[PDB]
Design a protein around this ligand. Structure first.
Ligand SMILES: [Cl-]
Length: 383
């Protein structure tokens, strides 16, 4: 009577997760599933995979450069041909393929965008923008109506990771494009007078209209910026869809909305993000058939639905009933799991930290050339 391991990385869902684990078992009396929640679970897993003590089912983040390397070594089962994969939106899992196969079932994913105060927007007669020029005017117009366009956490450069990645993606037409310009170009090819660069500069200057941000944003942090937002201290703030929960808790006094960053024209906005509840399988598990049994469980609607009514992140499984056109994340996720919902660019980076910093530095100083330099310094050791 067999027993298998799900090395879970999603620590905050572990209740509803074991909850599920049981009622899968409640009806598979010939399978055990023990649910691993070790601290330092990132480095635990790396050591083991490499030590060849690989878990039966892994919650592994598919943008990871573990997964690229592990898959292209032979650690995971090829799931391209599974039928429960039919159940993912669009081509969606294919966006993490290795050598044209799929090795991970992305059940849910984050996204990134601009949160905004609707009541505000209503009373001030203000429209969600749909082009860089409109965004820029929206910020000017708010400053003029005597309020604060942005909450910006000057001390958490990562809060603007998405914003800048979306700047390059909208300016170049998508992830593949953005990474061509940035990462797969020759060394020192990023140049201040590139049309793209000028565009990117432009998206970033929206963050430095005069008056755009809240007092002392310079040294503000995430949890701070959440507050300003829920208070009304500002009308907007760039961030992931993870924020919504935190934001809900200052019990804000108005209805929250979100919009996707626009590109240069209508119909051209874009959002970024990756798999969050996402699964792969050892190519070397004992009882393979059992693992596969359990993934296809999770892919069932009534199962997902049960995870979703609690987690609330956009889910790429069909026949789950998701929050509707006026949930707070409705705009931010209006094209999730399609091609206008890019995988995080750094999926093909050796790191990101330098990027979050060249990003805030620029918001902080305005130094255009500095950022171009910052950028090749960041990417150049890409040989
Ligand atoms: Cl300012």
């Amino acid at each position: 009577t067999v027993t298998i391991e799900y090395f879970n990385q999603k620590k905050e869902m572990t209740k509803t997760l074991e909850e599920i684990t049981r009622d899968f078992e409640k009806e598979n009396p010939k399978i055990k599933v023990k649910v691993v929640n070790v601290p330092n679970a990132g480095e635990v897993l790396k050591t083991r995979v490499l030590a060849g003590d690989v878990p039966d089912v892994v919650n592994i983040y598919p943008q990871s450069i573990e997964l690229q390397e592990w898959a292209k070594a032979g650690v995971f089962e090829d799931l391209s041909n599974k039928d429960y994969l039919k159940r993912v939106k669009n081509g969606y899992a294919e966006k993490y393929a290795v050598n044209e196969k799929v090795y991970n079932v992305p059940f849910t994913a984050n996204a990134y965008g601009i949160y905004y105060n609707k009541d505000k927007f209503e009373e001030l007669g203000l429209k969600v923008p749909e082009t860089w020029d409109e965004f820029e005017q929206l910020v000017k117009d708010i400053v003029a109506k005597g309020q604060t366009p942005f909450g910006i956490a000057g001390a958490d450069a990562w809060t603007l990771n998405g914003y800048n990645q979306l700047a390059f993606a909208t300016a170049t037409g998508g992830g593949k494009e953005a990474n061509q310009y940035l990462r797969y170009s020759q060394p020192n090819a990023i140049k201040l007078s590139d049309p793209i660069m000028k565009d990117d500069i432009k998206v970033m200057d929206i963050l430095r209209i005069n008056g755009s941000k809240q007092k002392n944003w310079e040294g503000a942090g995430y949890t701070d910026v959440i507050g300003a937002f829920a208070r009304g201290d500002v009308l907007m703030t760039p961030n992931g869809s993870w924020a919504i929960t935190a934001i809900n808790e200052q019990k804000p006094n108005f209805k929250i909305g979100t919009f996707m960053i626009p590109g240069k024209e209508k119909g051209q906005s874009l959002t970024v993000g990756a798999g969050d509840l996402a699964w792969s399988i050892s190519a070397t598990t004992k009882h393979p058939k059992e693992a596969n049994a359990f993934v296809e469980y999770m892919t069932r609607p009534e199962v997902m639905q049960k995870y979703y009514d609690v987690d609330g992140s956009p889910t790429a499984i069909e026949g789950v009933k998701q929050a509707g056109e006026d949930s707070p994340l409705a705009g931010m996720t209006e094209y999730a799991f399609t091609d206008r919902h890019l995988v995080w660019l750094q999926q093909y980076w050796t790191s990101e930290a330098d990027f979050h910093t060249l990003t805030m530095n620029y918001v902080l100083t305005g130094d255009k050339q500095g950022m171009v330099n910052d950028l090749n310094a960041f990417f150049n050791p890409m040989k």
